């Protein structure tokens, strides 16, 4: 299942989804980073290549592994790179994901879980990319090391939403 995360703001699933809707609407990021989610180096490279373009970014981690970090590595990404939101695709089902996510919510970060697998047709992921597109998304930044599945999906996404795709 997927988890979308935003940092704490001065400002349940239904209300929570609307808060993320409002966020993407106000932020209007120009880039989305697609990375595997294990190597921080890879995410670091792609983030730099986004600031270099003066693009605000969302991060999409396609093959995220929880390890023993309890999502502390996602929090560190907010701090170090200033991503407006982070999406992680996990091997967990929704109920376990919502459960595991409780730890990051304890720190003020808002997190919303929805069902799905990275390889499968996902309408919620389409809703996110579409809304990003509607609000000004310009480019997909493919970090080094992506699987051919994600690379191919990214190219189709660039074609669908009329985006530049950067490697």
């Amino acid at each position: 299942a997927f988890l979308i995360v935003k940092g704490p703001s001065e400002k349940r699933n239904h209300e929570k989804a609307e808060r993320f809707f409002e966020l993407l609407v106000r932020e209007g990021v120009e880039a989305i980073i697609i990375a595997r989610g294990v190597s921080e180096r890879e995410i670091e490279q792609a983030a730099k290549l986004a600031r270099e373009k003066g693009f605000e970014a969302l991060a999409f981690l396609a093959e995220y592994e929880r390890r023993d970090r309890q999502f502390d590595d996602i929090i560190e990404y907010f701090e170090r790179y200033g991503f407006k939101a982070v999406i992680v695709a996990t091997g967990l089902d929704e109920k376990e994901l919502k459960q595991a996510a409780q730890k990051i919510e304890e720190k003020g970060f808002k997190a919303l879980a929805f069902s799905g697998r990275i390889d499968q047709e996902n309408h919620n992921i389409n809703d996110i990319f579409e809304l990003l597109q509607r609000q000004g998304l310009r480019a997909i930044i493919a970090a080094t090391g992506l699987s051919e599945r994600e690379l191919s999906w990214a190219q189709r996404a660039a074609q669908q939403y009329g985006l530049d795709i950067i490697f």
Partner: nanobody, 123 residues
Framework: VQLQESGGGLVQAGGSLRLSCAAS????????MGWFRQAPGKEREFVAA????????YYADSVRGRFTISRDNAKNTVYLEMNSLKPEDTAVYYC??????????????????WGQGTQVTVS
């Protein structure tokens, strides 16, 4: 959210018919708009659905090629253009609203708001 269908009626096989559904409510609550249909004795089933921008549209296999969904967001109206109508297409057609990030467009349980239905009869 408030929804209201129009455009239903009687048509001959091979004939065309255009459905309209006027929606009130915001972009979040009506991000996805869909058409479902129900014949007597049968379950309400998915027909066609569109995202807000139309960049994602979904169709029942029984219906693609023949039916085309579209939206006029300025009026928050959704249309279903039905061509090459078949008698098996006879049913009450309902429009429905699915909030942003509401899950699969195919599943009627993901639509929180429903219209009152418009009868479509193909003889």
């Amino acid at each position: 959210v408030q929804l209201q269908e129009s455009g239903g009626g009687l048509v001959q096989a091979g004939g065309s018919l255009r459905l309209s559904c006027a929606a009130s409510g915001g972009t979040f609550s009506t991000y996805g708009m869909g058409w479902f249909r129900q014949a007597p004795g049968k379950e309400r089933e998915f027909v066609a659905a569109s995202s807000w921008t139309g960049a994602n549209t979904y169709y029942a296999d029984s219906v693609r090629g023949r039916f085309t969904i579209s939206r006029d967001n300025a009026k928050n109206t959704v249309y279903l253009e039905m061509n090459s109508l078949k008698p098996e297409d006879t049913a009450v057609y309902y429009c429905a609203a699915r909030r942003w990030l509401g899950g699969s467009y195919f599943d009627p349980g993901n639509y929180d708001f429903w219209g009152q239905g418009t009868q479509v009869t193909v003889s």
